Amino acid sequence: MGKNDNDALIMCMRCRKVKGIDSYSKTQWSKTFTFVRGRTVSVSDPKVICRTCQPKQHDSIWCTACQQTKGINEFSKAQRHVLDPRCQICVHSQRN
Numbered sequence: 001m002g003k004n005d006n007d008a009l010i011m012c013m014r015c016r017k018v019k020g021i022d023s024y025s026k027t028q029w030s031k032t033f034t035f036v037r038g039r040t041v042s043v044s045d046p047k048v049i050c051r052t053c054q055p056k057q058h059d060s061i062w063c064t065a066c067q068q069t070k071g072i073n074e075f076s077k078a079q080r081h082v083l084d085p086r087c088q089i090c091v092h093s094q095r096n
């Protein structure tokens with residue numbers, strides 16, 4: 001499960017930087033090999049990027065109740081429509 005085969009280093013095509021499963025996501029690193037006839041096989045040419053090389057953005061809503069940035073996950077849909085969104089926690093704190 002990592003006796004010595006965990007020293008594999010995948011070259012990044014983005015920053016031409018070579019790193020191990022450390023700087024490589026498990027999902028991306030897994031693409032280094034595929035399953036054939038029920039046998040593990042190394043991909044001929046696996047194209048992957050670094051964790052930082054890949055994009056990462058998420059929508060959020062500014063709250064004036066606590067003056068803290070929060071995602072839309074912890075924010076009700078209606079709270080997003082209003083002109084003054086309030087965290088699902090702030091609303092239960094201000095008794096609205």
Ligand SMILES: [Zn+2]
Binds near residue numbers: 013016017
């Ligand atoms: Zn990279």
Ligand SMILES: [Zn+2]
Binds near residue numbers: 063064066068086087
């Ligand atoms: Zn708030």
